[PDB]
Design a binder for this molecule. Structure first.
Ligand code: NA
Ligand code: NA
Ligand code: NA
Ligand code: NA
Lengths: 211, 211
């Protein structure tokens, strides 16, 4: 959840907002070790419920998210239903566990490609055009992350937009991401420069991957 | 419906057969002028019902067809239901009126392309990949006619098969068609040659379009 003024500004300027719970457990092995554990349900519930209670009157918020990169666990299913029960006005999405689980109203993959399948075990990223028509599938598809804009990037961006426009149920996506997470450091002359992972002595670090 | 031996040979050699009623009213304006007319329902019904009564014990027949190129009339809907009621063991398909009407269990377009839409008014031919995931659509897609093999042709044939293999609900199609409808004529020396429309003084005619 963002600084509260963010939603007021999106209300007034007009942007659609996905409001997302402060839950990510990417580094767990496997990713759902905590989110499938009922012992972590109370901590998770407060991150979801206290978000909804704060932001539910903002028109700009059109979709709730259960967080990111936390696999798919029983705690997600419980909290998905809680939101559906408490606020039927907004769809609930969540990408973990393969982007099309029982805890999401929207097929919301990250970096699924337009035409090319990436058939990973358990969590495949299907071609977005293919994903829509898998046997029994009827949901809209909106990528929660695509077109990773790291450095000299956005090659192939036009391919996404051609597909978005051609397929009714391909309803867009959210670029990753808006702003480089570089930080200003100063050299011996007091001149500013842009720093990334490791430039503060931080170790282990993931270098430029924050930009 | 074919010569009765055809089905016996398909049973024994092993080919899946679409058995099709002898109904085509292509030259009508509009195409459904007769098939929407209850006056033509008795004549159409006999073409459907007597086919089923004749061929329903052949294992090679896996799908019934209501005919071809006769638009979509109320008579098709009546006869679709008649088959569903009398023989539940076989799907019913019919292409007329846009390939995805209430008179067909299978989306069965003719010459719909792989990636390119042809948005004709009333009866568009969508890209087959796009067609599958149109809002609310759930049926399999099997082209009743595709890859028109006229003369030096079948360009782009590989494109269909890549898509057939990638998409579960794209379950193939029927090439148009098997054999040139050319006829034998003879020159002054008795040498045979291949003839097409117009070569018999037949007029109006559609020339080489029979091959
Ligand atoms: Na779209
Ligand atoms: Na990053
Ligand atoms: Na297929
Ligand atoms: Na022809």
């Amino acid at each position: 959840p963002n600084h509260p003024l963010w939603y007021t500004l999106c209300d007034r300027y007009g942007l659609y907002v996905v409001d997302e719970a402060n839950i990510e457990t990417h580094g767990m092995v496997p990713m759902n070790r905590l989110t499938d554990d009922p012992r972590w349900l109370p901590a998770m519930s407060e991150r979801v419920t206290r978000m909804v209670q704060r932001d539910r009157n903002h028109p700009s918020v059109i979709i709730w998210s259960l967080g990111t990169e936390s696999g798919h666990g029983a705690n997600h299913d419980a909290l998905y239903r809680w939101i559906k029960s408490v606020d039927p006005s907004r769809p609930v999405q969540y990408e973990g566990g393969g982007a099309d689980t029982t805890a999401t109203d929207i097929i919301c993959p990250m970096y699924a490609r337009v035409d090319e399948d990436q058939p990973f075990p358990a969590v495949p990223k299907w071609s977005i055009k293919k994903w829509l028509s898998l046997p029994g599938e009827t949901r809209p598809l909106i990528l929660c992350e695509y077109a990773h804009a790291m450095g000299n990037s956005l090659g192939g961006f036009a391919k996404y937009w051609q597909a978005f426009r051609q397929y009714p149920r391909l309803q867009g996506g959210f670029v990753w991401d808006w702003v480089d997470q570089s930080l200003i450091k100063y050299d011996e002359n007091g001149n500013p420069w842009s720093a990334y992972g490791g430039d503060f002595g931080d170790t282990p670090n993931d270098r430029q991957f924050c930009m």
